[PDB]
Scaffold this active site. Structure first.
Site, PDB file in Angstrom:
ATOM      1  N   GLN A   1       0.843  -1.203   0.000  1.00  0.00           N
ATOM      2  CA  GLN A   1       0.000   0.000   0.000  1.00  0.00           C
ATOM      3  C   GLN A   1       0.875   1.249   0.000  1.00  0.00           C
ATOM      4  O   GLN A   1       1.913   1.268   0.653  1.00  0.00           O
ATOM      5  CB  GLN A   1      -0.946   0.008   1.210  1.00  0.00           C
TER       6      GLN A   1
HETATM    7  N1  LIG Z   1      -7.257 -15.272  -9.427  1.00  0.00           N
HETATM    8  C1  LIG Z   1      -6.154 -15.070  -8.688  1.00  0.00           C
HETATM    9  N2  LIG Z   1      -6.225 -14.344  -7.576  1.00  0.00           N
HETATM   10  C2  LIG Z   1      -5.019 -14.248  -6.953  1.00  0.00           C
HETATM   11  C3  LIG Z   1      -3.821 -14.803  -7.349  1.00  0.00           C
HETATM   12  N3  LIG Z   1      -2.819 -14.471  -6.449  1.00  0.00           N
HETATM   13  C4  LIG Z   1      -3.413 -13.740  -5.543  1.00  0.00           C
HETATM   14  N4  LIG Z   1      -4.762 -13.571  -5.780  1.00  0.00           N
HETATM   15  C5  LIG Z   1      -5.704 -12.806  -4.964  1.00  0.00           C
HETATM   16  O1  LIG Z   1      -5.361 -11.436  -4.988  1.00  0.00           O
HETATM   17  C6  LIG Z   1      -5.638 -10.811  -3.706  1.00  0.00           C
HETATM   18  C7  LIG Z   1      -4.381 -10.150  -3.155  1.00  0.00           C
HETATM   19  O2  LIG Z   1      -3.442 -11.123  -2.732  1.00  0.00           O
HETATM   20  P1  LIG Z   1      -2.329 -10.745  -1.688  1.00  0.00           P
HETATM   21  O3  LIG Z   1      -1.438 -11.921  -1.652  1.00  0.00           O
HETATM   22  O4  LIG Z   1      -2.989 -10.301  -0.425  1.00  0.00           O
HETATM   23  O5  LIG Z   1      -1.560  -9.501  -2.292  1.00  0.00           O
HETATM   24  P2  LIG Z   1      -0.399  -8.634  -1.734  1.00  0.00           P
HETATM   25  O6  LIG Z   1       0.473  -8.328  -2.936  1.00  0.00           O
HETATM   26  O7  LIG Z   1       0.249  -9.389  -0.632  1.00  0.00           O
HETATM   27  N5  LIG Z   1      -1.032  -7.276  -1.152  1.00  0.00           N
HETATM   28  P3  LIG Z   1      -0.435  -6.384   0.020  1.00  0.00           P
HETATM   29  O8  LIG Z   1       0.985  -5.987  -0.380  1.00  0.00           O
HETATM   30  O9  LIG Z   1      -1.328  -5.183   0.239  1.00  0.00           O
HETATM   31  O10 LIG Z   1      -0.273  -7.274   1.244  1.00  0.00           O
HETATM   32  C8  LIG Z   1      -6.241 -11.916  -2.843  1.00  0.00           C
HETATM   33  O11 LIG Z   1      -7.668 -11.887  -2.929  1.00  0.00           O
HETATM   34  C9  LIG Z   1      -5.694 -13.189  -3.485  1.00  0.00           C
HETATM   35  O12 LIG Z   1      -6.519 -14.318  -3.241  1.00  0.00           O
HETATM   36  C10 LIG Z   1      -3.761 -15.573  -8.539  1.00  0.00           C
HETATM   37  O13 LIG Z   1      -2.789 -16.150  -9.051  1.00  0.00           O
HETATM   38  N6  LIG Z   1      -5.008 -15.665  -9.165  1.00  0.00           N
END
Ligand SMILES: Nc1nc2c(ncn2[C@@H]2O[C@H](COP(=O)(O)OP(=O)(O)NP(=O)(O)O)[C@@H](O)[C@H]2O)c(=O)[nH]1
Ligand SMILES: [Mg+2]
Length: 166
Positions: A54
């Site tokens: 974020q």
């Molecule tokens: N369809 C799909 N959704 C995915 C995939 N990888 C992650 N997501 C979804 O995308 C969203 C964000 O995932 P997240 O791992 O929390 O992202 P982040 O990069 O860690 N975000 P932050 O840095 O704010 O913590 C979640 O709802 C997750 O289930 C993927 O390969 N396919």
């Protein structure tokens, strides 16, 4: 080896780490600070740092540049509205003196979604072919489905290993 995982919020950084750790992704929430996971594979000891993306906490990324052995940059391949933001942040990272020469793995994530851009399109937008100062690789993947992750980690290991020659 110390691995740093960066990329915009919602790109899928924490989901990739839990997928590598063979654990449950149902219960993942946005990362307020950062996560650490130790992983042992193929004779290697990886210590992996997953930092929240974020914008409000993005200035903290620079705290972790010291003693980085490899950089993983994750991008949501299906979210084209955020490509300009993802390129701006990566180009800033590659100008950091503390990251001189550090190998770069780009994970083009969420290939399972409709409208996901191909790896070659993502490479063009990020201008990867103009890099001269480090080894680099782009790998298409889906963290939800497990594909592509093994291939990416194998490239990264080759770059950081003590290599024996004859
Ligand atoms: N369809 C799909 N959704 C995915 C995939 N990888 C992650 N997501 C979804 O995308 C969203 C964000 O995932 P997240 O791992 O929390 O992202 P982040 O990069 O860690 N975000 P932050 O840095 O704010 O913590 C979640 O709802 C997750 O289930 C993927 O390969 N396919
Ligand atoms: Mg996260």
């Amino acid at each position: 080896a110390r691995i740093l995982v960066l990329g915009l919020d919602n790109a899928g950084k924490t989901t990739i780490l839990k997928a590598l750790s063979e654990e449950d992704i149902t219960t993942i929430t946005p990362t307020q600070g950062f996560n650490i996971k130790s992983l042992s594979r193929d004779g290697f000891n990886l210590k992996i740092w997953d930092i929240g993306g974020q914008k409000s906490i993005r200035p903290y990324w620079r705290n972790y540049f010291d003693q980085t052995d490899a950089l993983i940059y994750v991008i949501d391949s299906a979210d084209s509205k955020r490509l300009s933001e993802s390129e701006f942040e990566l180009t800033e990272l590659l100008q950091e003196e503390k990251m001189t020469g550090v190998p770069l793995l780009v994970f083009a994530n969420k290939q399972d979604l409709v409208g996901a851009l191909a790896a070659d399109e993502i490479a063009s937008t990020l201008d990867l072919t103009s890099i001269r100062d480090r080894p680099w690789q782009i790998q298409a993947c889906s963290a939800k489905q497990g594909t592509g992750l093994k291939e990416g980690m194998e490239w990264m290991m080759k770059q950081v290993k003590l290599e024996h020659h004859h």
